[PDB]
């Protein structure tokens, strides 16, 4: 079933900040904001962890769209291959979630990678979830239109943070 990261890195503070730093041409800004909040609350509502949205500076969870190299030693690679990636909880790049601007992203109303599912998967990583062996799990390693966290996803996050 679920994986965490080696040594179970987790947020140590009651409150974790997150910033949507950069946006996609594919969607309105507010749509990315509301889908990220939704992706975070899907994990959030299961655990004793609270997210505060910040609109400037460095937050614990830096979220954005990037083309190619974007300062974290894991450059994006243009259309296809890598779609997105994220870092386990930690200082600096820890917690950060990046989306490759050279794919196509949708809110579900158009063609594209479903951004809500993608953001739920990457922010799983941001909170300390590894890849699940369970195909139903959002944290399954391969890529959505109508979904929720699986019982494996809930089990894993609650094992790392506790319930409620």
């Amino acid at each position: 079933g679920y994986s965490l990261f080696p040594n179970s890195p987790k947020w140590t503070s009651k409150v974790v900040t997150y910033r949507i730093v950069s946006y996609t041409r594919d969607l309105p800004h507010i749509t990315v904001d509301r889908l990220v909040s939704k992706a975070l609350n899907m994990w959030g509502k299961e655990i004793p962890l609270h997210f505060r949205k910040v609109v400037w500076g460095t937050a614990d969870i830096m979220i954005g769209f990037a083309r190619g190299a974007h300062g974290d030693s894991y450059p994006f690679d243009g259309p296809g291959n890598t779609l997105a990636h994220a870092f386990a909880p930690g200082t600096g790049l820890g917690g950060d979630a990046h989306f490759d601007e050279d794919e196509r992203w949708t809110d579900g109303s158009s063609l594209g990678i479903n951004f809500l599912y993608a953001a739920t998967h990457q922010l799983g990583h941001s909170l300390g979830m590894g890849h699940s062996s369970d195909p139903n799990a959002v944290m399954y390693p391969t890529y959505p239109q109508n979904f929720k966290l699986s019982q494996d996803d809930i089990k894993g996050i609650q094992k790392l943070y506790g319930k409620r």
Binding site: H85, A86, H125
Partner: peptide, 4 residues
């Protein structure tokens, strides 16, 4: 992709 999950990195450290």
């Amino acid at each position: 992709x999950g990195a450290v």
